[PDB]
Amino acid sequence: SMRLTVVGANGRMGRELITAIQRRKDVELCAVLVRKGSSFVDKDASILIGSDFLGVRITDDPESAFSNTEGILDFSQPQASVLYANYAAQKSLIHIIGTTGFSKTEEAQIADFAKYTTIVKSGNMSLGVNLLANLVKRAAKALDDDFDIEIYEMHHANKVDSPSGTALLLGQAAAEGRNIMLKNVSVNGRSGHTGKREKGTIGFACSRGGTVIGDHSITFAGENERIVLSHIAQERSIFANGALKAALWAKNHENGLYSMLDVLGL
Amino acid sequence: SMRLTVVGANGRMGRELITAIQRRKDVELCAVLVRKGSSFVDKDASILIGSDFLGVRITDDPESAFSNTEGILDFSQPQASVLYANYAAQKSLIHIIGTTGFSKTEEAQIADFAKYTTIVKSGNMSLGVNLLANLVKRAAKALDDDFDIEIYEMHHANKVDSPSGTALLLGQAAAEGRNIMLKNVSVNGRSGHTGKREKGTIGFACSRGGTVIGDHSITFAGENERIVLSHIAQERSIFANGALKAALWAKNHENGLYSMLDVLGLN
Amino acid sequence: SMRLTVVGANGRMGRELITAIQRRKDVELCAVLVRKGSSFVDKDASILIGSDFLGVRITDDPESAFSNTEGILDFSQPQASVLYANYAAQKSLIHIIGTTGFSKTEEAQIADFAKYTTIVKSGNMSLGVNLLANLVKRAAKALDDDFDIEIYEMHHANKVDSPSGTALLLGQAAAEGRNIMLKNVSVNGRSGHTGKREKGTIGFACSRGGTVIGDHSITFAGENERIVLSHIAQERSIFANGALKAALWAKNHENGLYSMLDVLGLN
Amino acid sequence: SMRLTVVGANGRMGRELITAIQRRKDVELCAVLVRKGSSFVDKDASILIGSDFLGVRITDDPESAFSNTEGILDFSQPQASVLYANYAAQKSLIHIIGTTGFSKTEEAQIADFAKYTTIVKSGNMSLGVNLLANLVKRAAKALDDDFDIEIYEMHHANKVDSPSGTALLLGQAAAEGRNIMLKNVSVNGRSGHTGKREKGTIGFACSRGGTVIGDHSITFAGENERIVLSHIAQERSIFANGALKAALWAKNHENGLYSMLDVLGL
Ligand SMILES: NC(=O)c1ccc[n+]([C@@H]2O[C@H](COP(=O)([O-])OP(=O)(O)OC[C@H]3O[C@@H](n4cnc5c(N)ncnc54)[C@H](OP(=O)(O)O)[C@@H]3O)[C@@H](O)[C@H]2O)c1
Ligand SMILES: NC(=O)c1ccc[n+]([C@@H]2O[C@H](COP(=O)([O-])OP(=O)(O)OC[C@H]3O[C@@H](n4cnc5c(N)ncnc54)[C@H](OP(=O)(O)O)[C@@H]3O)[C@@H](O)[C@H]2O)c1
Ligand SMILES: [Cl-]
Ligand SMILES: [Cl-]
Ligand SMILES: [Cl-]
Ligand SMILES: [Cl-]
Ligand code: NA
Ligand code: NA
Numbered sequence A, D: 001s002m003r004l005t006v007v008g009a010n011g012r013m014g015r016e017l018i019t020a021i022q023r024r025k026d027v028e029l030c031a032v033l034v035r036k037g038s039s040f041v042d043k044d045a046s047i048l049i050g051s052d053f054l055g056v057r058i059t060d061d062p063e064s065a066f067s068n069t070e071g072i073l074d075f076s077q078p079q080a081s082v083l084y085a086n087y088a089a090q091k092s093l094i095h096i097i098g099t100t101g102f103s104k105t106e107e108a109q110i111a112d113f114a115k116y117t118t119i120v121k122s123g124n125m126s127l128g129v130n131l132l133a134n135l136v137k138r139a140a141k142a143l144d145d146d147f148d149i150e151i152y153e154m155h156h157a158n159k160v161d162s163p164s165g166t167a168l169l170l171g172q173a174a175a176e177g178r179n180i181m182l183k184n185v186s187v188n189g190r191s192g193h194t195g196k197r198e199k200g201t202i203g204f205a206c207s208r209g210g211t212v213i214g215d216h217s218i219t220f221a222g223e224n225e226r227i228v229l230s231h232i233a234q235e236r237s238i239f240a241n242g243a244l245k246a247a248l249w250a251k252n253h254e255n256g257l258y259s260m261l262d263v264l265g266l
Numbered sequence B, C: 001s002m003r004l005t006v007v008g009a010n011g012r013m014g015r016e017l018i019t020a021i022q023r024r025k026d027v028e029l030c031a032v033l034v035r036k037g038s039s040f041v042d043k044d045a046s047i048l049i050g051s052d053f054l055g056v057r058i059t060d061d062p063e064s065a066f067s068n069t070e071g072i073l074d075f076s077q078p079q080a081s082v083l084y085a086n087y088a089a090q091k092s093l094i095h096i097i098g099t100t101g102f103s104k105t106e107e108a109q110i111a112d113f114a115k116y117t118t119i120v121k122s123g124n125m126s127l128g129v130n131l132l133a134n135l136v137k138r139a140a141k142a143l144d145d146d147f148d149i150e151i152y153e154m155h156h157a158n159k160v161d162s163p164s165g166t167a168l169l170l171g172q173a174a175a176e177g178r179n180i181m182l183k184n185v186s187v188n189g190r191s192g193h194t195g196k197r198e199k200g201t202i203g204f205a206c207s208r209g210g211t212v213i214g215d216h217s218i219t220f221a222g223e224n225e226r227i228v229l230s231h232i233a234q235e236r237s238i239f240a241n242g243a244l245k246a247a248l249w250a251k252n253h254e255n256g257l258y259s260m261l262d263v264l265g266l267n
């Protein structure tokens, strides 16, 4: 049984990770971290998921949360995750990073930390999205830039980052298929533009509303036809279980920065 | 069979109107009017659409164009449309007005002319778009603002306006339903922002690619359910189809100033 | 805060109702009623949903369940619901009835009891599903039958009914709008047929796969345009949310027999 | 310039083929066939597409239509197309068959005729659908039968055959990815069924209405997620131009029965 610590524990994904660890025999909940000053500090982890007593006391202290564990499961917030990757480097812990919305400097620091430990970082832990990204790359290679690539997503009202990490991951697969660089061709929010569409660009549109877990669609819009490739997440458990799969894969793996592709195949 | 005159005939909807009238038995093209000094004056109407000879000689004289007709189909210019509405009042002709850009004074005159004849005036003449707008307004009134309103549209690569005019029309339907002002609550391209969504706002997302004629979708996204209302345009001829419905509905209707909501039976 | 009793509590919507009431401040669980001799009698209501102790002891006595409450939330059985409607009439309690299968006599009695209290009765209690039905009926009336009506739904692999009950409800909305009888115009699975589509029919296509909670889409497909009206369910809790809206709306409303259309403001 | 004859000339696809041949320099309209007793017989082909005089007189006689030509372009009706494939065999003409809805015997006869001439037969002439079929095969191989495959399509009110030929082609790609046989696992119209879904089956749902040129969607519905792959045809010109591309490819090719995959790559 792998011993795992859940950070951002009171968040949507945090609670979902605790629920998933509890229903499985192959992973063990050994610590739960929340922010300093949280009313959950000192309570039993059971309170986060309405379960039976777990015998795991919630802490706000990373030293405590990380003292007797084999891995960190982290869907939280970008500044927090860089901080936890440093702890992961210092203490030689595996770090599963689901968090999205990192800057370039943050990503550079996470790469530094991957020199000292094993880190699986991915903007989507689901099997379906990782297959979709592959299909989008093949599509973007088979269809030349007479087919305009346009990426749409919808998520719940409280999502902080846009485009989603999944959208960016899908855009990067499309850019690879086209042998171009995403940063050179991406256009966020055509809604706030005037002009002819520029050929070869990849557009991003994003809706935010209600409680939607996550829809993503990539349209290839050519002359009198469209190919549309899509993914619909029904619930967050798919990402919780992808993270657990990544933890188990990382356990005795060598140091480095890895993706769900590495975990899955693929 | 209803006799119709198409005005602004070398302009935006003129060819579509003439094409649509030519293929139906229930409407008859009896006149075609163009701007003063047009190359098309004195040519047969067939030259505008590449058909066989139609027996209708294009004119730039409104006196001739309206001399023996039952309705005016008009997607031209505001000042021309006020003039033609006066002809419609004087001669008891129905007037389908798809023109946009009217001043307040011009709108008051059109209201005057509606005392004497039947006028149907709408900036968008698609049966489906006007239906959708009405359903959107109804949904926006029925659902509290714990249902978030997000509006999406997709159009061909070369489209200039963004968001589309139809998106804006749909947005204004939602704002009306919610008793708020579109201009205070609208957010364009959440893609280019960070942070939680602000309550009661209406988002607009726009996609541009390929040759898409026009898709519009309004999502009402609430607690664990969504309602999604969409219009998918296949051909630009839909605006001529609606204009003709409006003409046929207007023919023996009582005088007044009407919209496509009236043509659809939605008041 | 409105005090509510959940009946049929070990049955279909009972747990969802209790869960939904527990997480809100504006409604208070004051009683829980189960069938005579249930294992759950005398247990705390928490045992039904695995929460902490709620201070509400489950009973099988309607006299106790209705002794000090303001409304009855009821997704149980017809004969029980008629009885509870009598309690609601005698005690001036609102009654939200999601029960189905009533006889004509039972429906007449419920109509009697609505002279003395406020009853909201609908076979489906989702705010979004009832809205959608209304918009479908409006669209079916507004668009002539040169717009073809096709109904699609998708549900999880294990779903028994096909087409879904919600699909049938939506179909009946369309039939009403068109002034026709669903049973004469419905076509199930055009997949298993050959030949042109017959005018005025309403088609039903059903997909089964995976864990999908329930997607429904109505297409009105006319000459070169389509209108598409959809409901997407995320969680089964939507039926409890609607039932609670109905309860809150019913509380100080005048007596009568109402539907979710009334709760939504759509008459 | 390749000399081509259009059969089923007054049909939707027939007219579209004539329009496409006329706008191109590399193909030449040399004959136009309609049914016996059609009012179009003896008129100039221009009447079918509202063009300028083409100097091609419409005939109802196959002997005449097929006497001085290099190929037959055929989107018509299954009995008619088997008849024309026989003429194609007898006269050594290439035959591009877009028609769908063939029985097994009809398909067996078309295979016989392919011994004597070159026949490209395909239920969809568009580039997008042939790429989509490939993506569906890869998807169906990457995702095991915990992902339920469900195919949906919508076409105009007057379409005769259901499911569409495109739906069947997509179902066959899915069956190959799953290493199963379509005929063993297909279920048409679940609407008229009661029961649990049977594992490994591929379902087909079809709407018919208005003027829709053709939408197709393949859903892979797993545990708490769906992948959906789709194609939207905007107009019939894409199929007319795919047929012309097939004619040009078939011109000096050896005898046999071929698909748009062969024409395209692919
Ligand atoms: N890769 C994937 O498959 C996947 C799937 C789903 C979501 N995501 C991503 O995962 C992230 C979290 O999503 P979510 O919806 O669960 O967000 P959420 O509900 O907002 O959860 C955020 C959690 O992070 C904690 N946190 C933030 N800053 C912190 C700090 N400085 N120190 C300690 N704790 C801190 C929050 O605590 P407080 O409550 O104290 O603020 C909270 O527990 C997002 O970036 C999202 O895009 C990824
Ligand atoms: N592979 C593709 O990419 C593709 C694309 C589009 C359509 N399709 C398929 O192509 C076929 C035609 O589609 P469509 O919409 O063009 O159909 P349509 O408009 O009904 O055209 C049918 C044509 O076939 C003619 N025809 C039928 N039986 C005949 C006979 N016994 N002898 C002579 N002529 C005969 C008809 O003549 P009358 O008017 O005299 O009956 C008409 O000209 C369908 O099977 C459709 O599924 C394939
Ligand atoms: Cl998220
Ligand atoms: Cl003009
Ligand atoms: Cl019970
Ligand atoms: Cl077809
Ligand atoms: Na465990
Ligand atoms: Na006419």
Ligand code: NA
Residues within 6 Å of the ligand: C021, C022, C023, C024, C025, C026, C027, C028, C029
């Ligand atoms: Na409560």
Ligand code: NA
Residues within 6 Å of the ligand: D021, D022, D023, D024, D025, D026, D027, D028, D029
């Ligand atoms: Na040519």
